[PDB]
Paper text:
The crystal structure of a CNT from Vibrio cholerae (vcCNT) presents the first opportunity to examine specific nucleoside recognition by CNTs from a structural perspective. vcCNT is an excellent model system to study hCNTs: it utilizes a Na+ gradient for nucleoside transport like hCNTs and shares high sequence identity (36–39%) with hCNTs with particularly high sequence identity for the nucleoside-binding site (64% with hCNT1, 73% with hCNT2, 91% with hCNT3). vcCNT forms a homotrimer with each protomer possessing its own nucleoside-binding site and permeation pathway. The protomer adopts a new fold and is divided into two domains: the scaffold domain that is responsible for trimerization and maintaining the overall architecture of the transporter (light blue), and the transport domain where nucleoside binding and transport occur (other colors). Two helical hairpins (HP1 and HP2) and two unwound helices (TM4 and TM7), related by twofold pseudo-symmetry, create a bowl-shaped nucleoside-binding site at the center of the transport domain of vcCNT.
The anticancer drug zebularine is a uridine analog with no substituent at the C4 position of the pyrimidine base. Zebularine exhibits a ∼threefold loss of binding affinity (KD = 120 μM) relative to uridine. To deduce the structural basis of the reduced binding affinity, we solved the crystal structure of vcCNT bound to zebularine.
Residue numbers in the entry:
A (entry chain A), B (entry chain A), C (entry chain A): 2 to 229, 241 to 416
């Protein structure tokens, strides 16, 4: 029952220690408090009444911002995003390109505005400050952790960019992990626009800040000594819109290609598999069969572990956006397999993260531009940081399933 | 009656003199003739029969070019831009993304072709030469003024780019003002595709050349001494298409974000306003209430000044593209408020200009790349140049309303 | 009958010799074997039974990959690419922007993957090696020839990029010609998605490798002495997707502008032509009237030579993508002129090539970046290389019509 979850949490911690760079250098206060916060935060907003009300209150505000932004895309694409689309095309009336992608544009502009007004820096300074006083982590790596709740892995270190070129290997690794453990505000609203419960997305985004530091300081403890703008608000929105547009195009091209490639792979796997009496062999079968123990370990029922593995596996070997796209039909009344509400929550939390191999290349570009002489260290710690980010997402899912 | 318009023209001139860098250095021949041309040009093509026929003749040619270009977008988006769209989605059958944006691509390619053939340089040389002989303005600043009738604020100085790094502060300011007072050929056809009367757009584009110089030489008189390609036609079209595409994407992202942001602001203004007994408070109400005196001053009737202020205000605090997008429904039979034909003309002229704060950043990029050591002067004169450009648009509207 | 084709082949060879840089330096083994291979390859896969089966087998595999990739665009654009589109908009239900353009994205990602796995380098090394052993051409120029079968003119030299800056003028010219004589895998599937028979596209792509070398070594014989990566597979796909997206946007903007420009030209040609009693004068009439002898020479019947000339002419003076777009309606049951199956094949082969003037600018960018000190030689040999590429496409069409 609940005993299988606590074992899950133990196993995840165990792997991180086995993969640590120095188990004897692990700060017990740091990693103890880090797990304490993520677990308590999970308990707070998923179990206790007052915490649940604050979460559903924040989520409804996020849901209101999404609808407001939809006025923009409604103007541009008109009746192609209206209700008449469902009367004509039925299910295919929902055009992903016009329904989900424009959200990335609006939210990138909004967060750009919130940075200009100092609202973002205000929240980050509070959360980032609470972490470093409780965990003993450095100032810079804690701010980047807190920022990563709302923005992406390449945008979060920007709030501490003059400290990045000279921060320690453990600091840099943590910064990498904070980005891999979390997502971004823009894609968040995208996933929400696909049917993913906002309550789970907001919850997972916040639990990423302590969770990211947790596995950063487990797998790479501090063995060194750390240290220590647009002209107007309209320009900020325009710049954010531009950045969002570029991101929207990239995600769209990736989804067309990757899905197309998976369709090509499934065709080949059917022919190759047929040679071994398995003509029905697909990529989803391999991934499900391979990740089922991992899904079963984080709290997914035995009879649903394989289907859960398909999504968790797809997120790891590609990215969370593709995983969510294949998991979204399972959130409607036209779902091929009716899953339990607890399993739906676990997958939602386990997928909520940029933790994949492709993000290393993205970290080399973004985070590497802030410190060009540190691109070697980033590439070297890349895979370890991806694993650490994966453990953080899996821990958050285990915690989530435990309190649900 | 007509007395309120002439007062309007006087007030606008008055503000420019009060904000001048040296009232004693103002060249009476320059600013006298500049106003004389803009006023006479307004009289010519809006009042006298022969001038009205030349304007409607040029506009019908512009309207024919638009339809020819529509063959391109009709090929790409097929039935999504056909008449069947209105039978199915009704009003929402008009998809802005496919109906207006592709025009920017076609017209950018066409103007690129016209530059290659020397047709553009031919017209600019005549109009630019007539201005400098009548106003006494320098050669370079006059060519940039004439070019700005047809192209954008960053493209117009390109016809005199080797003279920009060494031109006087008054010359540079004028170049900045010529761009802010006018629009571009590409967006022109876009506004026309939204229901804005082409006759008003062409008229305002031409009146921008003397009007831009007028307020440039009022607010910043000359106190110094001024001085003095693609391989084939198919390459020119391709390059122009590419530039148009990039612009089309930017405008689209901006419209999605800005409209979405306004929707978000109106939601917040309803809550904040509710604290003061004004739950119906919106951005349009603030802008209308604040710009109504200005609209009333340029010739808009008292009972229509507030609605007119909403659009003029939105153009100033954001850009003219967003203003036109909110003003276009007022040009159809489904308009929420039926406005007088004179008020519709005034708003059309007052909106026709790139005069906004965001254009300073764009001027720093485009015009600043032509003279990197002059980016300080551009940023310093930015706001003054925006005001000057605003006065030029307001003057053109007052003149327009006077002869109508 | 078949005598008119062999005359055609002779004439094409004749022009190349007349335009040669040194007729006395032409290697008879090189150009003899080069024509021998292209002619035999044509005989193999268009005439002999076994060769026809291998071609239709490869084409059905290409047709299967296309459909697999379509799962990606089907996810993004939903019902806008469904069968319901034809029930509502009829013929206009086929939206080119969503039906053809996304193919460039998928195929660019796939070929990027195939390069990473070493599959591309494996095939190129075999075909490129067979050519240089049979023709006596250099190693580098032969690999670029073989690569050009599957990829574009700027991508093909990348497999021999450290040998490009120091290769001979004849080598560089051949590299330029190999790219101009062929197309790319991505646009190939695009043309196939417009109704162009895949069998003709695959055939022409392969016959371009010897055909490109053939006219390279005729018009520019060797008079000198020649010499002699993404972190993971998912990164490769993502990079290829990005490159495909950029290309998809460019092609789309070009098609909107060029078609729009042609519509504008036809309007002007109707007025200008009206002055000489020819109000029905259009661009298609001029191009058809001017290229009809050329089409008649390559095997197109007298009564179909003029219509065939319209398409061949449009490909030359613009690009093959625009030509195919105007030729595609002639491949359906709603064709304005029912053409013979042999004429449809000839046009398909004659159009299959990047041979146009605009590609010189593209060669200056791509191939010129690999050897910046050789941009002068590229620009100098540009037009000659375009002619050579045109002759290669015309030869392939003549050969095709001969065996059909
Ligand atoms: C959808 C509608 C929303 C309604 C909200 C309207 C907001 C109004 C924006 C005004 O902001 C100002 O704009 C200036 C222009 O960019 C800035 O000056 C900046 O640039 C000037 C010159 O360009 C310099 O003089 C200054 O030093 C520099 O602060 C200045 O910082 C900024 O405060
Ligand atoms: C929709 C259909 C429209 C129908 C219209 C057809 C127009 C025909 C275009 C031909 O233009 C020529 O093309 C050359 C190739 O770019 C240019 O040579 C340029 O480039 C050459 C080599 O690339 C150099 O030899 C030259 O010096 C240099 O002028 C040359 O300037 C230009 O006149
Ligand atoms: C749609 C689903 C498809 C299913 C297929 C799944 C394929 C699995 C990809 C794994 O590939 C590895 O990924 C590493 C990470 O990029 C690479 O390490 C590279 O980068 C490392 C660090 O980033 C370095 O340690 C290495 O030196 C360097 O080889 C490595 O080369 C590569 O073999
Ligand atoms: O780096 C990112 N920043 C913002 C949004 C997205 N991504 C990247 O793109 C992917 C898809 O959302 C993520 O897994 C991540 O690697
Ligand atoms: O600078 C520009 N050049 C061409 C088109 C548009 N714009 C900018 O974008 C805005 C929207 O049309 C203008 O206000 C102007 O600042
Ligand atoms: O250079 C290219 N590489 C890949 C795809 C396309 N093109 C260019 O764009 C044109 C349209 O397919 C070609 O004629 C060619 O010049
Ligand atoms: Na993040
Ligand atoms: Na202008
Ligand atoms: Na090629």
């Amino acid at each position: 029952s609940l005993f299988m979850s606590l074992i899950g949490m133990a196993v995840l911690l165990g792997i991180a220690v086995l993969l640590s760079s120095n188990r004897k250098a692990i700060n017990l206060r740091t990693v103890g408090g880090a797990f304490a916060i993520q677990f308590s935060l999970g308990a707070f907003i998923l179990y206790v009444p007052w915490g649940q009300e604050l979460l559903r209150g924040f989520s409804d505000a996020v849901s209101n911002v999404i609808n407001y932004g939809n006025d923009g895309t409604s103007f541009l694409f008109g009746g192609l995003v209206s209700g008449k689309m469902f009367e004509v095309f039925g299910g295919g009336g929902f055009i992903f390109a016009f329904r989900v992608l424009p959200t990335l544009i609006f939210f990138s502009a909004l967060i750009s505005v919130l940075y200009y007004l100092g609202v973002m820096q205000w929240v980050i300074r509070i959360l980032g400050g609470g972490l470093q006083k409780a965990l003993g982590t450095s100032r810079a790596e804690s701010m980047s952790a807190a920022a990563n709740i709302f923005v992406g892995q390449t945008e979060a270190p920007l709030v501490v960019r003059p400290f990045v070129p000279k921060m320690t290997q453990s600091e840099l690794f943590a910064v990498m992990c904070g980005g891999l453990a979390s997502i971004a505000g823009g894609v968040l609203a995208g996933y929400a626009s696909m049917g993913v419960k906002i309550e789970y997305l907001v919850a997972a985004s916040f639990m990423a800040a302590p969770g990211g530091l947790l596995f950063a300081k487990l797998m790479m403890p501090e063995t060194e000594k750390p240290q220590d703008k647009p002209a107007n608000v309209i320009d900020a929105a325009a710049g954010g819109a531009s950045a969002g547009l570029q991101l929207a195009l990239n995600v769209g091209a990736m989804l067309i290609a990757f899905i197309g490639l998976i369709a090509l792979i499934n065709g080949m796997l059917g022919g190759i598999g047929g040679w071994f009496g398995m003509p029905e062999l697909k990529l989803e079968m391999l991934l499900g069969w391979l990740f089922a123990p991992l899904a079963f370990l984080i709290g997914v029922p035995w009879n649903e572990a394989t289907v859960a593995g398909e999504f968790i596996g797809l997120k790891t070997v590609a990215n969370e956006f593709v995983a969510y796209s294949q998991f979204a039909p399972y959130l409607t009344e036209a779902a091929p397999v009716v899953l339990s509400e607890k399993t739906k929550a676990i997958i939602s939390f386990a997928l909520c993260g940029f933790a994949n191999l492709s993000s290393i290349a993205i970290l080399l570009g973004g985070l590497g531009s802030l410190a060009p002489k540190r691109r070697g260290d980033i590439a070297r710690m890349g895979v370890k940081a991806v694993i650490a980010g994966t453990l953080s997402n899996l821990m958050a899912a285990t915690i989530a399933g435990f309190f649900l």
